[PDB]
Amino acid sequence: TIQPGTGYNNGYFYSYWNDGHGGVTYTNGPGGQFSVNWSNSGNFVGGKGWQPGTKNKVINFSGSYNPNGNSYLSVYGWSRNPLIEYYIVENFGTYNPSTGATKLGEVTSDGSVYDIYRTQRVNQPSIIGTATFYQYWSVRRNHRSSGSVNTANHFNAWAQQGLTLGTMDYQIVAVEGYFSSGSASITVS
Ligand SMILES: O[C@@H]1[C@@H](O)[C@H](O[C@@H]2CO[C@@H](O[C@@H]3CO[C@@H](O)[C@H](O)[C@H]3O)[C@H](O)[C@H]2O)OC[C@H]1O
């Protein structure tokens, strides 16, 4: 298991963050593989990918994803200037992260329609410190734990709708939890 932070493992960038509550272990495996095991966690996000990401990467993911409670499985990353936290959500647990959010469009990609949303975080942790920032979401209608994500289809649809991204920071396939339990084993490429 590893220490919250960022770095490289077997050629892949990783990021593992948590709120300090406990109840979650993150492990880096061979190649693009990582695993998460959590029991009565707080808020955490971990996974493997790239630093920096790109606006036209085709990302593959494969494995198992077994949340018990509030959790997401997504292509996840940030842009700077403007600061944006973004998600291409392929699966989730008890909570659709777009609940109560205003729908800003649809995009069809990689075998499913996705619904597009913008939300806002206020005085929340980020890659540059505590801040207020927008989040962009593509939420897949057909849930899955393996597949291919053509990120350009999402970024282009977001930009079309006025959801523009700045300079890309990291870009990973992430398991996120918010006060839940679960297990996951995911291989990225
Ligand atoms: O040391 C700093 C790290 O702690 C910092 O990490 C980022 C902190 O914010 C995390 O984003 C949250 C993830 O969960 C979502 O539900 C919330 O909306 C976000 O606030 C992000 O994942 C971490 O990378 O990065 C900068 C370091 O100095």
Side-chain angles (χ1 to χ4, degrees), residues 11-36:
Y12 286 86
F13 178 79
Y14 69 85
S15 178
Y16 170 41
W17 169 86
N18 71 47
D19 66 2
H21 176 81
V24 48
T25 60
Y26 173 92
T27 306
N28 279 322
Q33 195 276 353
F34 67 95
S35 286
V36 194

Side-chain angles (χ1 to χ4, degrees), residues 15 17 43 45 76 78 85 87 121 124-127 133 135 170 176:
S15 178
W17 169 86
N43 193 196
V45 172
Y76 168 80
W78 293 80
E85 187 180 35
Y87 292 79
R121 297 310 310 260
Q124 299 295 334
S126 83
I127 57 160
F133 52 94
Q135 310 174 290
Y170 71 73
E176 174 164 349

Side-chain angles (χ1 to χ4, degrees), residues 126-137:
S126 83
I127 57 160
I128 55 69
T130 301
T132 289
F133 52 94
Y134 291 115
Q135 310 174 290
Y136 301 163
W137 305 84

